[PDB]
């Protein structure tokens, strides 16, 4: 379990191992790395804002 | 008073003239590009 | 602004506080408390004790409110704290329907009021809570969210027609 | 001459913030201050240290020696414009102006750097000046003047592939990433640990090893962790040197759930009295706690405090309040029971963590663009 | 301009949320470990 | 004069009504004009294309190409071309008679 | 004393130059060019006059001793100015009085000749025609007499200067307001002078007579003219009807004048703030918190300017009264720590489940509450504190005993843990079931009616907001 060789869960009073899996987490990367860069987009536009103001 | 304030709050309505300014420059844009 | 003192000033506002609490005028209840800033807070227990009463009525405390009702050594207040009695009667009769999955009868006798009344007939018949053996029994009800699936689908029809409508605009 | 210059700011941190720790620091601060002819950077600490009873002559003779050393170069400039080399004036007194700036404040920096920067066409001197800016901006913790020429240096780096500046700025941006709460970047920048020259900021390569283990035990879970710090060898020999470094590694990889806070007690009490972790050690502890609790709770679903009391430690109520706060903190989802003595886990925690970070970044970005879009048109 | 009429008068913040978790209870939590290792 | 000065303003109110109605339909019409104008531009290629190579560009909407007829020309360009697709050295279609970038 | 003798000549003339030429050029532009300018509710020199008011809000306040503006008052009031050929010798006199101020010393006539400093607009059958000339020349003299801040024997002459300003209201409401908008120039001048008028009434009793006057002053908009005076007078009506408790607020509800549609981003933003506090006092939170947030981010244009920190203070009162709460010092200032830290300790107390930390802070800083006028938090915030505590512990424990959580949250009794958790269900916080035989509160978990319903509703708000960004962006881009 610890080495991610295996997707299981143990029992002590029952001695039962149970296997379960749900792979896809593409939405997190999919939107988060957009947003992290668009932070830097708007921070680049900060300078143009300060130029038009003063 | 009746023929006094009516002209004033008619001339209040002249923001439509500035809307016509906006749309006139827009028509200028499209006509010149065409 | 001369304002000489009077006889029932410190509890006439308590009378109004009491019945305007018994009308559930909570916005009025908290805009009335403004004209006397520290009189309603630092002192005047027939303002502070009605709003400490309401401080107990904030969350859910039932019989501590009735202890505070069992001690007012001021004048009557009775014609409005009986309205407060009744607005607690239907408060238990409202919050009964929650996870009191079974309750023994005499604790409901303690909290509600009236040991073996015909008010137990009033609650057990006007309400549900089937008068079985020593127990108000809890029935079950469900929602299933079955059909909707469609009010989601048609409210999304509304919302995405709106998204497409605002993206749509052109004039 | 800014190579021994880091221990100065080290002691600036180490003296004033612990109250009782105020004797050895001011001792060897004197032992470093009345030599090297230091004058400017300690007026604040002079108002933090003692009266320094005679400030009259003992420092004015020093700044007079500084004036002699200063205008011998400022009267060497006319002797060096006689034979114009590579502007031998500016090439001589660039590093001696950084000597003067090791004496002085950052004004000598901000004019001498940009002075001698446009002199050279050999970019190695430019790189040395950029190193000088990064170091003195780290000294005054000016975390914004340095991020300019980090990028402006990586432009001067990446005309190809090199040795020097690549590995150097790996160390530099590693220290900047460990300055802020940035840990996976700190591990990725401290990935190398092989060609990291025994330096003045790497005042011990062993301390560099302690830092790169003290962030790699947070950053990744286990999909390179054993391979770098356990299956590796070049790190393994020098972690085999110190006991305490190898201690927590083989503890946490062994899952000795009681010696953890012993190891963490030593590392944390050192972490208190160590710089560039001052807003950091608090979240560090709960980070290690949740990182241990993850690998504990992953294997079992039928577990409780009755398993905690013998394999983890004592104070069942402490386990209770700690896990209560950490679970109710939206972290490590698993549900606990009262006196029936049950700690059950939620077997996937990947439903709302899916939905989570996107709304949590869109909040800040929309809050940005609200105000900043309403900045224009008044 | 903008005289703002006067009759009236990361580095810092995410770990201040976390510090509001850390504030009232267990500030320098390192000794309470060693305090309670012998209590029970 | 206020009878006149009040009655004559109704004319200008009617005028602003008229033009505010009018420029909307003009704006709607000109896009239909614009797309058909775009495609009436597109009669240029159709089957006599000769192949030059891109050499240089002066500025916006002006370039320099040298044909495979050996010589070298100062030509104008169409507003159709996405300007990413050019300016190392590209085989480009020229008109025969006009000899311009297409 | 010789050093002070040569520290006497240089302080007059440079104020006597720029403080002269500001109203010379600016007021000349304003009064002359207000004849044309088809939108002259405020001319561009009237916004420049606003800017010079921002200058002498920090440059000079008093009637200026050392003989500098002390001659500018009998200079700038002594103006008949019947027609432009009768003003050319006065245009020479604008420098000739400076020659008088340079040859000899000036004559500072304070508090005696100020009332015959009001008879010079009568000089040899003078003019009532240019009322923005006389209005601006009744503000810029007479309001720095209030910025002298004397409060001695001349507050009645302050008031009589404002009675001659009521005569300026007479000439404002009678004298030929057809299309010149001298009235609306005097509406911005009226805004200014009603703030300082208001400060005079701050140093004295309640103005209930002048509150009826202020009622009429508000109602005289929207029918005679309708531009921005209704805004300024709306907040100037609000200023004490907030501070006085009674009716006024149902009037703010039934007020069909929330919308003066532009207020130079200052009055409109603070109007949002004032009505945010108004909606906040009647326990309505979500309707109020959005205009609180908008009013904070709407007029931010300083660093720790004061009432910016009053709005930043009051903004998280309602969010202590929500249940969701942000860390407030995200906009902390080095001029702010004093006025944030007890309030920050309050929100520190609220962001845990404890109530014994919370109850001490009332008795601690109830005098601070007496200062801040926010007693209403303490009567009802205990409710939100205990809801946060039970929410936290219900998310913690899958199956809890009431006779443990009650004493963990100092409830002193197990039987009303039934009551508090029963309305944690009735009020809809928690779903958790109870056996009221053993006293255990088991809680379960679910998802996916979350994901079917909850995010899309938020995304609707996000995209409605961003398409409004797009709408406003295009419709403000299209001026060229």
UniProtKB/Swiss-Prot annotation, chain A:
Conditions for induction: By FOXO4; expression in embryonic stem cells (ESCs) is mediated by FOXO4.
UniProt modification remark: Phosphorylated by AMPK.
Expression sites (tissue/organ): Highly expressed in embryonic stem cells (ESCs). Expression decreases as ESCs differentiate.
Superkingdom, natural source: Eukaryota
Recorded family membership: Belongs to the proteasome subunit S9 family.
Subunit structure: Component of the 19S proteasome regulatory particle complex. The 26S proteasome consists of a 20S core particle (CP) and two 19S regulatory subunits (RP). The regulatory particle is made of a lid composed of 9 subunits including PSMD11, a base containing 6 ATPases and few additional components.
Name of the protein described by the UniProt record: 26S proteasome non-ATPase regulatory subunit 11
Organism: Homo sapiens (Human)
Name of the gene this protein is made from: PSMD11
Shown residues in whole-protein numbering: 369 to 422 of 422
UniProtKB/Swiss-Prot annotation, chain B:
Function: Component of the 26S proteasome, a multiprotein complex involved in the ATP-dependent degradation of ubiquitinated proteins. This complex plays a key role in the maintenance of protein homeostasis by removing misfolded or damaged proteins, which could impair cellular functions, and by removing proteins whose functions are no longer required. Therefore, the proteasome participates in numerous cellular processes, including cell cycle progression, apoptosis, or DNA damage repair.
Signal peptide: none
Residues included from the entire protein: 24 to 57 of 406
Coiled-coil stretches: none
Protein name per the record: 26S proteasome regulatory subunit 8
Subunit organization: Component of the 19S proteasome regulatory particle complex. The 26S proteasome consists of a 20S core particle (CP) and two 19S regulatory subunits (RP). The regulatory particle is made of a lid composed of 9 subunits, a base containing 6 ATPases including PSMC5 and few additional components. Component of a complex with USP49 and RUVBL1. Interacts with PRPF19. Interacts with TRIM5. Interacts with NDC80. Interacts with PAAF1. Interacts, in vitro, with the thyroid hormone receptor (in a thyroid hormone T3-dependent manner) and with retinoid X receptor (RXR). Interacts with ERCC6.
Subcellular location: Cytoplasm; Nucleus
Family: Belongs to the AAA ATPase family.
Gene: PSMC5
Superkingdom, natural source: Eukaryota
From Swiss-Prot, chain C:
Name the record gives this protein: 26S proteasome non-ATPase regulatory subunit 8
Crosslink feature (Glycyl lysine isopeptide (Lys-Gly) (interchain with G-Cter in SUMO2)) location: 118
Self-association and partners: Component of the 19S proteasome regulatory particle complex. The 26S proteasome consists of a 20S core particle (CP) and two 19S regulatory subunits (RP). The regulatory particle is made of a lid composed of 9 subunits including PSMD8, a base containing 6 ATPases and few additional components. Interacts with DDI2. Interacts with TASOR.
Domain PCI: 1-152
Function per UniProt: Component of the 26S proteasome, a multiprotein complex involved in the ATP-dependent degradation of ubiquitinated proteins. This complex plays a key role in the maintenance of protein homeostasis by removing misfolded or damaged proteins, which could impair cellular functions, and by removing proteins whose functions are no longer required. Therefore, the proteasome participates in numerous cellular processes, including cell cycle progression, apoptosis, or DNA damage repair.
Family, per entry: Belongs to the proteasome subunit S14 family.
Signal peptide positions (record): none
From Swiss-Prot, chain D:
Any single biological process term in GO: proteasome-mediated ubiquitin-dependent protein catabolic process
Gene3D superfamilies with a match to the protein in the record: 1.25.40.570
Cellular component annotations (GO), alphabetically ordered: cytosol; extracellular region; ficolin-1-rich granule lumen; nucleoplasm; proteasome accessory complex; proteasome complex; proteasome regulatory particle; secretory granule lumen
InterPro entries noted in UniProt: PCI_dom (IPR000717), Rpn7/CSN1 (IPR019585), Rpn7_N (IPR045135), RPN7_PSMD6_C (IPR049549), TPR-like_helical_dom_sf (IPR011990), WH_DNA-bd_sf (IPR036390)
Assembly and binders: Component of the 19S proteasome regulatory particle complex. The 26S proteasome consists of a 20S core particle (CP) and two 19S regulatory subunits (RP). The regulatory particle is made of a lid composed of 9 subunits including PSMD6, a base containing 6 ATPases and few additional components.
Keywords recorded for this protein, A-Z: Proteasome
Primary gene name: PSMD6
Described purpose of this protein according to its UniProt entry: Component of the 26S proteasome, a multiprotein complex involved in the ATP-dependent degradation of ubiquitinated proteins. This complex plays a key role in the maintenance of protein homeostasis by removing misfolded or damaged proteins, which could impair cellular functions, and by removing proteins whose functions are no longer required. Therefore, the proteasome participates in numerous cellular processes, including cell cycle progression, apoptosis, or DNA damage repair.
Pfam families listed in its UniProt record: PCI, RPN7, RPN7_PSMD6_C
Domain PCI: 182-350
PROSITE patterns reported in the protein's UniProt record: PCI
